Structure formats: C-alpha cells, structure tokens
Design a protein around this nucleic acid. Structure first.
Ligand SMILES: Nc1nc2c(ncn2[C@H]2C[C@H](O)[C@@H](COP(=O)(O)NP(=O)(O)OP(=O)(O)O)O2)c(=O)[nH]1
Ligand SMILES: [Mg+2]
Ligand SMILES: [Mg+2]
Length: 341
DNA sequence: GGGGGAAGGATTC
DNA sequence: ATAGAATCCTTCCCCC
C-alpha cells in the first residue's frame, strides 16, 4: 500500500497572502480576537517569517505583540479559508477516488491503484505540488509511506514546501529512533506518561508488558502504538462523514446569571443551524467552558429531528442543568449538534 | 460477560 | 495568559 499525505503550509496565513501578495515576506500572524478587551484572544497561525521569533498558535495575542509589535495582525476569516480549501481538495479527487479529508489543511490519498513504487509516488507528488500552485497559488507539503501515520510523519519533517518518502526500512529505522511524542496522536498528556515508563521510541512498546501500557494511556492508544511497533498498522483511506457541527462563543463578562448567557447561547444556535443547512440533527449538546478553563457539557438525544424552535427550547434546560450542578462562573458558552439524518 | 448510550479527557487543528 | 472546531476514546451507569 502507498499513502499520499498533503499538509498545506501555514494554510491560514498563506491564503491571506494569496489574497494580498504585498504581505509575502513580512511576518503575518492571524488572530482570534475574543472581544472581552482589546487584543484579547489567541493566535490561530503565523507564517514561517513570524514563526522564527516564536509567534505560533496557542500563545495569546498580547504575547505575540511583545515579540513582534509591528507584524501584520489580521482577523481570522475561516469562511474564506474554507472556500480556498475545498477548491484545492476538488483538485485532489482527480488523483484517487479513495481520499480522506483529515482537516482543513490535510488530506490522505490512497494511490496504490494508481502507482506501485515510491519513485512514481514521488513523481506524482510534485505534479500535485504544482497543479495546486498552478491554479490556487498555494504551496503544500506532501508525504508518502506505507500507511496514514508515516505519510503524516514524512510531511512533518518535509514541510514547508516539502516532499518526502519514508521507505519500509526507514520505517524500521524510525520505530527505533523516533521520539514517541512525535507520533501522530500522542500529545503532551500521554507523551509524559510514556517517559514515566521509559518509552522514548515506538519499539519500547513491545519490551514492556501490556496492562502496564493499557492502564496508563488507554486500550485503543495501546493497541495503536503496539500495531505500529510491529509494522502491522493496517488502516485505510475512507470518506470522512462530518459527524458533528457546533459553535461556541466567549462572553465579555464571566457570569452564571441565566438571562446573561441566553444571548450568547441563542447566537450560538443561529450560527450552528446555518452551518447545518439541510442537515437535521437528532442530538444537541450544550458545551460550556468554566472561568477556570475546564470543559463541562450536557446533552440529550431525540428519536426525531430538531427544528430551531426545539433547539432554542432544549438548550436552556441543558444550560439550566449545568448551572444546577456546578458553582463556577461560565466563560465560554456554546452548543453542538450530532446524529444527523 | 458484554451491548449501548450520555458526560470528561485528550489530540490537533 | 488562557480561541475555535471536531474527532476519537475512557469511564460510569442502565440493560440483556
Ligand atoms: N482557531 C484555531 N485554529 C487553529 C489552531 N491551530 C491550528 N489552527 C488552524 C489554522 C492552521 O493554519 C490550520 C492548519 O494547522 P496546522 O497543520 O497544525 N499548522 P499549519 O499548516 O497552519 O502550518 P504548519 O503546518 O507550518 O505549522 O489549522 C488553533 O489553535 N486555533
Ligand atoms: Mg498545514
Ligand atoms: Mg494540520
């Protein structure tokens, strides 16, 4: 099997430059203004010119300005970045019927019925990397290996504007030399938990016995890293059906008074039902972030569809149930819809 | 013993 | 100081 991976380079900032080529070369940093005061929020992404001085996703907009107070700070236009992303995807379907859209800047191509050697897979790559540059003027980074994981890891080192093939005996090489936090699916919570058991590379998952591994990171994670250690990561490319749609907004004031959170909640449903459009959910969840950044939610499943009048009605009792069972101020309110028809 | 949901956790975008 | 969005997974609990 041969898997082809596509990670658009700093996709949000790149699109802003395609629409305003003057920015090309300057530190661009796209922001998520929360609104509670001036320059409150997070950085969604920053182009590599701004990445150098440590302007990355996650750090608040304040810190991103003590570092580069003269960079170009633009508000995120996710609706514009989506329209550009779909046009790029609709050019990738021209290379395989079996394609998986992972995220907005990510896609796997199963091209085993279109090539059969990493050399022709490599030669397919640039004809991707340039058809995209030909029609949408965006650079991408492609990775190719024997499964969806190492194709991911390939692009993880090749980016930006990169191309990389990880052959089946570098796969053997990596299992023994790859820091395991750099395995896709292992964030900081579980990376630390692995060091605590002396697991630095993927091979150490077989030297240790199983239930020591399961009880700390979980059964699916354990059976996941275990299958990659023995070079037995199956896993194909299948169309991803969007199973959830929602929106969650941040209040200008921390509060728990219900008639203060009703406006933000009702505005979260108006946008969510627009994002739905012809999709009827059977379940609504009321997500809420606390004043201490914790995450609590209450939901319900209906045997039928939910019309905006029924979502307006349900979301207030789920909201009541939250405040019923916790004493903390609410910082972010939202809603989320699943179980579509 | 195990199927099958509704609420916190963790990854990544 | 600490966005938004969505996926999968674990854990507790009702049910054969
Ligand atoms: N709202 C929001 N959006 C984010 C966040 N993180 C990423 N995104 C959105 C905006 C990101 O541009 C888009 C893709 O994210 P990546 O693949 O993780 N990084 P990119 O491809 O951008 O650059 P490079 O690969 O060179 O780091 O996901 C975030 O924390 N918040
Ligand atoms: Mg990318
Ligand atoms: Mg990505």
């Amino acid at each position: 099997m041969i898997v082809l991976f596509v990670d658009f380079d700093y996709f949000y900032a790149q699109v802003e430059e395609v629409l305003n080529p003057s920015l090309k070369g300057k530190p661009v940093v796209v922001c998520v203004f929360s609104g509670r005061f001036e320059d409150s929020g997070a950085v969604a992404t920053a182009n590599y010119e701004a990445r150098k001085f440590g302007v990355k996703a996650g750090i608040p907009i304040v810190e991103a300005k003590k570092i580069l107070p003269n960079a170009v700070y633009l508000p995120m236009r996710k609706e514009v970045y989506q329209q550009v992303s779909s046009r790029i995807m609709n050019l990738l379907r021209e290379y395989s019927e079996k394609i998986e859209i992972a995220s907005i800047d990510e896609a796997y191509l199963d091209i085993s019925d279109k090539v059969r050697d990493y050399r022709e897979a490599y030669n397919l790559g640039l004809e991707i990397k340039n058809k995209i540059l030909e029609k949408e003027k965006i650079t991408v980074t492609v990775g190719i290996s024997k499964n969806k994981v190492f194709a991911k890891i390939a692009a993880d080192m090749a980016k930006p504007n990169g191309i990389k093939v990880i052959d089946d005996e570098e796969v053997k090489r990596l299992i023994r030399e790859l820091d395991i936090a750099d395995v896709p699916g292992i964030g900081n919570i579980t990376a630390e938990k692995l060091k605590k058991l002396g697991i630095n590379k993927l091979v150490d998952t077989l030297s240790i016995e199983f239930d020591k591994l399961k009880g700390m990171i979980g059964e699916a994670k354990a059976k996941y890293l275990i299958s990659l250690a023995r070079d037995e990561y199956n896993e194909p490319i299948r169309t991803r059906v969007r199973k959830s749609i929602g929106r969650i907004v941040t209040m200008k004031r921390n509060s728990r008074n219900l008639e203060e959170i009703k406006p933000y909640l009702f505005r979260a449903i108006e946008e969510s039902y627009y994002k739905l459009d012809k999709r009827i959910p059977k379940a609504i969840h009321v997500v809420a972030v606390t004043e201490d950044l914790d995450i609590v939610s209450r939901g319900r499943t209906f045997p039928h569809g939910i019309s905006k009048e029924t979502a307006y009605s349900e979301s207030v009792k789920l909201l009541q149930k939250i405040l019923e069972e916790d004493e903390r101020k609410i910082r972010r309110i939202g809603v989320r819809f699943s179980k579509f028809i």
